[PDB]
Amino acid sequence: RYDSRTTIFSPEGRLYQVEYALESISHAGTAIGIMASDGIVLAAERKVTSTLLEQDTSTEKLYKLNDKIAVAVAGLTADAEILINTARIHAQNYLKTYNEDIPVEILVRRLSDIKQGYTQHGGLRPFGVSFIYAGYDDRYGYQLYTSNPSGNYTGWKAISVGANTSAAQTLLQMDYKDDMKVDDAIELALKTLSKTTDSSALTYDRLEFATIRKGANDGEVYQKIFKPQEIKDILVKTGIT
Amino acid sequence: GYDRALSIFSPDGHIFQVEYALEAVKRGTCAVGVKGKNCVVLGCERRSTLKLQDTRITPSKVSKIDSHVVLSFSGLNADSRILIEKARVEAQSHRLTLEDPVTVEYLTRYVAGVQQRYTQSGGVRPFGVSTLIAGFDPRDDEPKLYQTEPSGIYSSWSAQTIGRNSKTVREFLEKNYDRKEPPATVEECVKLTVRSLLEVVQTGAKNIEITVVKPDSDIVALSSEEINQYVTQIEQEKQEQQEQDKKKKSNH
Amino acid sequence: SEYDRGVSTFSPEGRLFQVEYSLEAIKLGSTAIGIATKEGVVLGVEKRATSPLLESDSIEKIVEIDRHIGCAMSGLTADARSMIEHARTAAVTHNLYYDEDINVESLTQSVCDLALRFGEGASGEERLMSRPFGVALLIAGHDADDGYQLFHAEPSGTFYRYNAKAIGSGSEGAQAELLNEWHSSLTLKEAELLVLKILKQVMEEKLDENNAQLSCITKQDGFKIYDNEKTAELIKELKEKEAAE
Amino acid sequence: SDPSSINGGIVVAMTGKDCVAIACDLRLGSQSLGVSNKFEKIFHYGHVFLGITGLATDVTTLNEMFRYKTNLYKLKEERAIEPETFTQLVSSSLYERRFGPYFVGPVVAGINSKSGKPFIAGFDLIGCIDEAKDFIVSGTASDQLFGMCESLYEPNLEPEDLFETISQALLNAADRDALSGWGAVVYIIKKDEVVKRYLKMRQD
Amino acid sequence: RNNYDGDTVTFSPTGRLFQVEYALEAIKQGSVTVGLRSNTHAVLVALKRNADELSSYQKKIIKCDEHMGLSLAGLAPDARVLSNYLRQQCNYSSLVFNRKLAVERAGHLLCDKAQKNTQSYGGRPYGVGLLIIGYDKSGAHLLEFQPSGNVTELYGTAIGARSQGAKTYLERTLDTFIKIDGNPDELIKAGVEAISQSLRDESLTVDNLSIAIVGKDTPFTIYDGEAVAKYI
Amino acid sequence: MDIILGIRVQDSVILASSKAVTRGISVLKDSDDKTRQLSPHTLMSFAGEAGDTVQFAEYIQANIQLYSIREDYELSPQAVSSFVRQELAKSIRSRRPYQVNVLIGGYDKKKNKPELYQIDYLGTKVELPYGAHGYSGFYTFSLLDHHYRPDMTTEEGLDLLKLCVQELEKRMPMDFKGVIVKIVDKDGIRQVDDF
Amino acid sequence: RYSFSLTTFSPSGKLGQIDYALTAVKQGVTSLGIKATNGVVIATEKKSSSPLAMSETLSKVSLLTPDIGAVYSGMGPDYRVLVDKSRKVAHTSYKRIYGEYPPTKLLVSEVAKIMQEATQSGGVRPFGVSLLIAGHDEFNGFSLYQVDPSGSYFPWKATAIGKGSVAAKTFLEKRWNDELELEDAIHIALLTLKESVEGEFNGDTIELAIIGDENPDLLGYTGIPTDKGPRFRKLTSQEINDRLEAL
Amino acid sequence: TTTLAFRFQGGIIVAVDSRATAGNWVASQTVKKVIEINPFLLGTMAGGAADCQFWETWLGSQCRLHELREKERISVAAASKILSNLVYQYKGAGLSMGTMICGYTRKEGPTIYYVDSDGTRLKGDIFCVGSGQTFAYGVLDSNYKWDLSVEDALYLGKRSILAAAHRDAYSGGSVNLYHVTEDGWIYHGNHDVGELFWKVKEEEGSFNNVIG
């Protein structure tokens, strides 16, 4: 119809192919980034589990981009793979050239342009992956963004991608407090994943989590991926288990 | 078919992909441009949806192309990004080649050229993005405001509305604004851009963004307070209007 | 019919439907009328605006090609942006190689050669143009080995020499009138006012100096784009003339 | 002469019982004119320490380049690169331009994390692993350093004594060369502490 | 069926392609020309058609080289290409081999040129018929080039609209014009007759006739306007 | 032929460049400019081969200013000098041998201090508070450091640059026909007339 | 129109080609891996489809590196190209950047990356197979992994794929223990695979190999202590038999 | 070759000679050495003659192209910089150049840029290019003023070419001056050196080691 090429537009004056790719992101699980002035928590959901699934020796919805920017993953992992690798390469290409770590804003911009190119040119598929980017660069402090499949970006103070977006967003903005705390944000995340996800228990092995903090020294940022057994201790504290 | 590609001329001499690109513009935000005699105001509607959206780190709908040429855009933001980057790179290149700053005319003709090229081929669709390019000439004062379309046609217009429900703004802009005598002051100019946008927002001074370009490489983007002060002055003169009708009715 | 979706592609009449389709795009355009006389070629146009804010004398429909070839255009300005630049290139590179004012007839062929390309590559010329152009041109100039000439360029790569030709919406009404009123004996002043007479009739707007724009190629004056004060003077001379009639 | 000989700079590394020492001069020279006295030459990417001697332009660009590959490595594997594995990376980068090679002579120093064995290696213009566990030298005074280090060296040294051995080795050799000296710096890599100690010394 | 006419890479069950026959039709849609020849001269006589009477015709004779030249019938975009290549081969022979290129071999490279776009996807068989006349070492020749690329050495043929009436004029009188030699005027007289039978609803004008001649000591010359008013 | 000098004080970089351009055995014009500004707080004085100076300086001027516009905030001196070293590093292994040595003296706004770099034609950047290139550095590396103290004021350092001009005039056999001095601070870049 | 290119998507997301690609996997024979705390056992079967056809010319168990073997489930021919490429990239991408045989996680990604390129193009079919890749390195230990047609990979404690997937999956869940040795795994592997065909089982029809301890025997050379023999080992037909007698 | 150019208030005088020399053989004593870029820009030939002839006509084709494209007159700055890029691309390939592009425009005033093949573009007010550039500066400076009459300015270029032509071996032939105004150059003819030199002797009292 007007799915038939990616380089043709519908008489409505939308593009069905892109819209369709946007629906691709609602067959994968929730990912939540909340920015606080005292840190960013990055949270991700594992949409597949089994009792023989090894998932306790692996990170796969948390990928470090350089030493100061990391992303959370929602969507197809095959789609994700190619763009994460490219992003890591460009961000650190900036490091070589300019002898400073890449600003958060430029690297998202670079990557959103490449997405638009796959729709604009050739007969390639658009990519149905929504990444929440969390970084630190001196020129605007903590910085949070997230990217659409279309190939554009918007800033946020909190955002949710993945499945059941509409509900999840509702829940976040009800319970947000403008100053926030890094600890209160983690707690908020878990509260939200618990409700959108049908895994009622919401166990450690179903959660990936990363916190970006400047608490390690000053002027120096430490990105710490939470490891499984640690994820289990903070569910007791919030009472979920 | 016959709308299935750009390489189909169609049995009516219309390129459907150019037509559908046009329809695309409407979905983006409203934008209005108004020239004075010592300014251009380049104004845009600023979208809101949530108060968890930043405005701190997030692009505006206005982007400085160089330092004396500016651009506002309407359409898909995703599409527009690539448009804006190319427009900028060329504007810097212009001084690589000649050692002059860019002309306003040179630039708009180029950005339509880039889409026209895309339109011409069949492999690639053109962008669904219309821009207003505002600026002043290299050494001179003479305000310049220009329009581009996805077809790759460019024009000059004294004043112009593009984006969501362009026509309904347009008619109002037409009536109040004149070709014969454009706004005296930069101040008066800005408020006219505010009247136009007021309509399309509903309520707001927080979903209205104002920027000014003036000659001599002067670009300033006006603070939010000053926009709030102006939406309130427009409501104050508007109240004077309601009453003035009541008085006129009593007299006669 | 249904054979028109490719970049060639016949057609039981034996025509290229794609090529033909682009002809009807020209009727979309704004009327453009030219009248050759042995004193010069007068190129007039119609300018259409969608609102009076559109700055009428900022849009291009008459353009300078070199210093002695001018063109008027009707159709898409998108398709004309590439087409015109080619013709400019051509004329400037001809002066480079030979120190000669390009011939009207050869300049026409030059335009029309780019035009021929409709493929995505093919034997003979290499084609990159993925669709017909959707703009015809009137090419007017003066060489000194064949005088003042008027050509009509088509985006079909057919070029006809003409003595008076109109295209766009008002094409049909203009062409009938020009059939009953051509002479070899027209002065440049009769030619100018003939363009305005015909132009009002095939207009469906109101005629002013901003919905009109005349120009000439005469060797002495070179290519001269007229002023609006100048163009108004002729409009005034128009009203005076019908009184007598 | 050789562009490597023109700009100058020395790098010398050593082995001990669970320690390695790696030291350099601070001299930057462009011909006989001394440019700088306080530019270091040893860098590090992770806990693997790299020196680079030779032409200055390739010494800074190859610092940037190996940093660049190791930071990709780190992210991918989710662990810091080892010296053993970094010694191969070093040869591979150098071999990639044979007929327009980088004029440098790298020295690799570290101690493995997987075994804790002390590790060092030497390189050359177009590069190969040149293995020892004695010492590696490079630079314009490389010929002075090669004999000078050997007399002083004994195996199974403590980290604090290994310092004495390298310091002595570098300073006197540096002094008796025109395009080296001019201040120094030494890193002693224990295991998990690195002490960085700048040599007070006579200027050249 | 004819669902097969949309690709030139697809054959029919009747052992055809549809696009190549359609390209044949395209010739007929255009102007008309008659070629004929003698042993010491070759002649094309072609009708110039104009869009309207302020329009001043279309040049239907393209001079190839000073021993060869050709006329067109059908679509003009197509003709300009085929002509260009042919001229290129005549100039190549003259530079590198110091030869006037044979009419037979030149016609044969054109047949090979046609098949290049027929085989490959994209491009099309050309939609113009060409009649090439020339004078080489082996004396006068008249070749009939076709869209297909079938090349046919003939004493007289005619292509274009309602051209069957010229072949009837030429068929009756076949042996007569072979015997004419040394007199170009008389081959022109025969050609003028010929192109009369082809017309319907028209009459010959000094600017309808365009007469093209090459022979033994005469190079290729195209007569137009006031050089066709001796034989009007 | 050609001098470029640098000294950094506690709030400014003073860069200076020779007025003369000598192409051939004739001084091609006596008074000229021979510095171009990359950014509104970063200055590039240049000297080297013929007309490679100009092309390279214009190349770098476009590209640093490009990033400034996109981010909406000018690059630092650490980044800018580094960019330029990258370029030189390509250029010496490229079919086209640029032979342009430069000094990058800027004001870091985010750090709030001057930074003066010496970047060589070969492609080596080192931060240095007295650098130069050519045969400028052959006389004045010694002279500066003698009368230089860590602390200075802008008035002292200009006068110390005048001292260095004098030395250069006696014992260097090239004329410079004066020197130009632009002072780069936090308040922009300004021309200050000195001999 | 939704299902019939790699370039097209649906109003339910995804591509038709990935769903069908998954179907291709399940048409294959049953192949399985069980991870133990000191090893990984990898097993597959061979169906000769004639007594004339030899069982050894089919190689469904292939060394990628001599530390990392693989099997597949799916279409036979597709396997063969992908193994040839897997080696070819194993040496290129991380044996001239690392200069020794890749860690398990890395190669998993490189193999995964080829699958991803074979989805990425419009007009190029994705692979007919999903692999299991089991391997060893020092840093992440013994490990076992699945590379699915999409270009996506998952680490697993135990899994199975192919036709016998539903019976095998439910067996593997019940019978895995927290801690187990390799030797015990061989017996659990054998018992699971026998579900899939009965009365045609035996150590000539069953291909079984491991990535267990080094064998300095099969290293090929001696007197150099720093290097180790291959961790990968192919069990012979007589060795399968011994282990089968002991059940 | 002795070309020299100098701005004054009246315009720009471009003064050039007409003797091209191969070696011991004198190749021509009549050669035009102002290549007329378009009505408004005058270039000069020195260095490689062949290079200068072709590319300067080429700058000229680009001038017309630029004029069409913008609907405004080229800038002096724009013309030079294009020629400067062009020659920088081919550097070191048997390309050599010795041009001043001289122009007087009603938006930038009189301007001279010397362009060289090695990518030098240098702004000046006095230039001299050639083998006789050495000789040209001498006379030219000492009798120069920014306030100078048109008639005297032409006189000034007449004495400079002759003083160089006398003492240079490769220079002579004829003296070609051109004066560029806002409405473009006016050619001031060809004056044979021979004849002209003697008149200048009587009036000025110069050339005393020449007895006639």
Swiss-Prot record, chain C:
Major site of localization recorded for this protein: cytoplasm
Gene3D superfamilies per the UniProt record, alphabetical: Glutamine Phosphoribosylpyrophosphate, subunit 1, domain 1 (3.60.20.10)
One BP annotation, GO: proteasomal ubiquitin-independent protein catabolic process
Span of the signal peptide: none
Entry keywords, A to Z: Cytoplasm, Nucleus, Phosphoprotein, Proteasome
A single GO cellular-component term on record: proteasome storage granule
PROSITE patterns on file: PROTEASOME_ALPHA_1, PROTEASOME_ALPHA_2
Location within or outside the cell: Cytoplasm; Nucleus
Residues bearing PTM Phosphothreonine: 50
Pfam hit, one: Proteasome_A_N
Phosphoserine PTM positions: 51
SUPFAM superfamilies listed in its UniProt record: N-terminal nucleophile aminohydrolases (Ntn hydrolases) (SSF56235)
Lineage: superkingdom: Eukaryota
Function: The proteasome degrades poly-ubiquitinated proteins in the cytoplasm and in the nucleus. It is essential for the regulated turnover of proteins and for the removal of misfolded proteins. The proteasome is a multicatalytic proteinase complex that is characterized by its ability to cleave peptides with Arg, Phe, Tyr, Leu, and Glu adjacent to the leaving group at neutral or slightly basic pH. It has an ATP-dependent proteolytic activity.
Further details from the record: Present with 17100 molecules/cell in log phase SD medium.
Protein family according to the UniProt entry: Belongs to the peptidase T1A family.
The protein's name: Proteasome subunit alpha type-5
Organism the protein comes from: Saccharomyces cerevisiae (strain ATCC 204508 / S288c) (Baker's yeast)
Organism lineage string: Eukaryota, Fungi, Dikarya, Ascomycota, Saccharomycotina
UniProtKB/Swiss-Prot annotation, chain D:
Annotated keywords: Cytoplasm, Isopeptide bond, Nucleus, Phosphoprotein, Proteasome, Ubl conjugation
List of residues that carry Phosphoserine: 30
Crosslink (Glycyl lysine isopeptide (Lys-Gly) (interchain with G-Cter in ubiquitin)) position: 69
A molecular-function term among this protein's GO annotations: endopeptidase activator activity
Statement: the UniProt record of this protein carries the keyword Phosphoprotein: yes
Cellular component GO terms held in the UniProt record: cytosol; nucleus; proteasome complex; proteasome core complex, beta-subunit complex
Major location (coarse): cytoplasm
Pfam families per record: Proteasome (PF00227)
InterPro entries xref list: Ntn_hydrolases_N, Proteasome_beta_3, Proteasome_bsu_CS, Proteasome_sua/b, Proteasome_suB-type
Cellular compartments annotated: Cytoplasm; Nucleus
GO biological process, one term: proteasomal ubiquitin-independent protein catabolic process
Lineage: superkingdom: Eukaryota
Sequence similarity: Belongs to the peptidase T1B family.
Function summary: Non-catalytic component of the proteasome which degrades poly-ubiquitinated proteins in the cytoplasm and in the nucleus. It is essential for the regulated turnover of proteins and for the removal of misfolded proteins. The proteasome is a multicatalytic proteinase complex that is characterized by its ability to cleave peptides with Arg, Phe, Tyr, Leu, and Glu adjacent to the leaving group at neutral or slightly basic pH. It has an ATP-dependent proteolytic activity. This subunit may participate in the trypsin-like activity of the enzyme complex.
PANTHER family: METALLOPROTEASE TLDD, PROTEASOME SUBUNIT BETA TYPE-3
Name listed for the protein in its UniProt record: Proteasome subunit beta type-3
Source species: Saccharomyces cerevisiae (strain ATCC 204508 / S288c)
Taxonomic lineage from the root: Eukaryota, Fungi, Dikarya, Ascomycota, Saccharomycotina
From Swiss-Prot, chain E:
GO cellular component: nucleus; proteasome complex; proteasome core complex, alpha-subunit complex; proteasome storage granule
InterPro entries named in the record: Ntn_hydrolases_N, Proteasome_alpha, Proteasome_alpha-type, Proteasome_asu_N, Proteasome_sua/b
Annotated crosslink Glycyl lysine isopeptide (Lys-Gly) (interchain with G-Cter in ubiquitin) location: 189
BP GO annotations: proteasomal ubiquitin-independent protein catabolic process; proteasome-mediated ubiquitin-dependent protein catabolic process
SUPFAM superfamilies: N-terminal nucleophile aminohydrolases (Ntn hydrolases)
Keyword field: Cytoplasm, Isopeptide bond, Nucleus, Phosphoprotein, Proteasome, Ubl conjugation
Residue(s) carrying Phosphoserine: 12
Compartment(s): Cytoplasm; Nucleus
Additional detail: Present with 7210 molecules/cell in log phase SD medium.
Family: Belongs to the peptidase T1A family.
Record's subunit section: The 26S proteasome consists of a 20S proteasome core and two 19S regulatory subunits. The 20S proteasome core is composed of 28 subunits that are arranged in four stacked rings, resulting in a barrel-shaped structure. The two end rings are each formed by seven alpha subunits, and the two central rings are each formed by seven beta subunits. The catalytic chamber with the active sites is on the inside of the barrel.
The protein, known as: Proteasome subunit alpha type-6
Organism per entry: Saccharomyces cerevisiae (strain ATCC 204508 / S288c) (Baker's yeast)
UniProtKB/Swiss-Prot annotation, chain G:
InterPro entries found in the cross-reference section: Ntn_hydrolases_N, Proteasome_alpha, Proteasome_alpha-type, Proteasome_asu_N, Proteasome_sua/b
Signal peptide from the UniProt entry: none
One of the GO biological process terms: proteasome-mediated ubiquitin-dependent protein catabolic process
UniProt KW keywords: Cytoplasm, Isopeptide bond, Nucleus, Proteasome, Ubl conjugation
Domain of life: Eukaryota
CDD domains found in the cross-reference section: proteasome_alpha_type_2
Cellular component terms per the entry's GO annotation: nucleus; proteasome complex; proteasome core complex, alpha-subunit complex; proteasome storage granule
SMART domains in alphabetical order: Proteasome_A_N
Record's subcellular location: Cytoplasm; Nucleus
Residue(s) of cross-link: Glycyl lysine isopeptide (Lys-Gly) (interchain with G-Cter in ubiquitin): 105
SUPFAM superfamilies with a match to the protein in the record: N-terminal nucleophile aminohydrolases (Ntn hydrolases)
Coiled-coil annotated spans: none
Functional description taken from the UniProt entry: The proteasome degrades poly-ubiquitinated proteins in the cytoplasm and in the nucleus. It is essential for the regulated turnover of proteins and for the removal of misfolded proteins. The proteasome is a multicatalytic proteinase complex that is characterized by its ability to cleave peptides with Arg, Phe, Tyr, Leu, and Glu adjacent to the leaving group at neutral or slightly basic pH. It has an ATP-dependent proteolytic activity.
Family: Belongs to the peptidase T1A family.
PANTHER family: PROTEASOME SUBUNIT ALPHA/BETA (PTHR11599)
Further facts: Present with 7060 molecules/cell in log phase SD medium.
Protein's recorded name: Proteasome subunit alpha type-2
Organism: Saccharomyces cerevisiae (strain ATCC 204508 / S288c)
Encoding gene per record: PRE8
